[PDB]
Amino acid sequence: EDTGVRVELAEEDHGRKSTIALRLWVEDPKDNGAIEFTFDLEKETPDEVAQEMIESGFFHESDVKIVAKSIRDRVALIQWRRE
Amino acid sequence: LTQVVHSAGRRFIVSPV
């Protein structure tokens, strides 16, 4: 299917960087802006960030698994393009 | 453009794009 939550790189992917800057926003919900944050690939979890975005007033409390996966897909997508 | 701090420390930057 599709999540409708776009997550993309914020800074040029340089490789061998344990932390990456990401940008998240929504285009299909099936503050209405773009959220920029850092993500540690070896330590932090997409579910952890998603909760924080919950406890920060971006999406609903039970909309956590959906945003967690949309971040997890981008983290996957950046490590597969990292071979 | 605003910065949003979660009570645990993570800083978000909110932008229009």
UniProtKB/Swiss-Prot annotation, chain A:
Spell out the post-translational modification annotation for this entry.
Autophosphorylated.
Q: List the disulfide bonds.
A: none
Tissue localization of expression: Expressed in various cancer cell lines (at protein level). Predominantly expressed in heart, brain, skeletal muscle and colon.
Record localization: Cytoplasm; Cell membrane
Q: Which family does it belong to?
A: Belongs to the protein kinase superfamily. Ser/Thr protein kinase family. WNK subfamily.
The annotated subunit structure for this chain is:
Forms a complex with the phosphorylated form of STK39.
Function, as annotated, reads: Serine/threonine-protein kinase component of the WNK2-SPAK/OSR1 kinase cascade, which plays an important role in the regulation of electrolyte homeostasis, cell signaling, survival, and proliferation. The WNK2-SPAK/OSR1 kinase cascade is composed of WNK2, which mediates phosphorylation and activation of downstream kinases OXSR1/OSR1 and STK39/SPAK. Following activation, OXSR1/OSR1 and STK39/SPAK catalyze phosphorylation of ion cotransporters, regulating their activity.
State the protein's name: Serine/threonine-protein kinase WNK2
Native species: Homo sapiens (Human)
Full-protein residues shown here are 455 to 544 of 2297
From Swiss-Prot, chain B:
Q: Which compartment or compartments is the protein found in?
A: Cytoplasm; Nucleus; Cytoplasm, Cytoskeleton, Spindle
Full-protein interval shown: 1247 to 1263 of 2382
Q: Which organism is it from?
A: Homo sapiens
Describe the disease involvement stated in the record for this chain.
Answer: Pseudohypoaldosteronism 2C: An autosomal dominant disorder characterized by severe hypertension, hyperkalemia, hyperchloremia, mild hyperchloremic metabolic acidosis in some cases, and correction of physiologic abnormalities by thiazide diuretics.
Q: Where is this motif: RFXV motif 1?
A: 11-14
Family listed: Belongs to the protein kinase superfamily. Ser/Thr protein kinase family. WNK subfamily.
Provide the assembly information: Interacts with WNK3. Interacts with WNK4; inhibiting the activity of WNK4. Interacts with SGK1; promoting its activation. Associates with the mTORC2 complex. Interacts with UVRAG. Interacts (via amphipathic alpha-helix region) with EMC2; promoting the ER membrane protein complex assembly.
So what does this one do? Answer: Serine/threonine-protein kinase component of the WNK1-SPAK/OSR1 kinase cascade, which acts as a key regulator of blood pressure and regulatory volume increase by promoting ion influx. WNK1 mediates regulatory volume increase in response to hyperosmotic stress by acting as a molecular crowding sensor, which senses cell shrinkage and mediates formation of a membraneless compartment by undergoing liquid-liquid phase separation.
Taxonomy of the source species: Eukaryota, Metazoa, Chordata, Craniata, Vertebrata
The protein depicted here goes by the name Serine/threonine-protein kinase WNK1
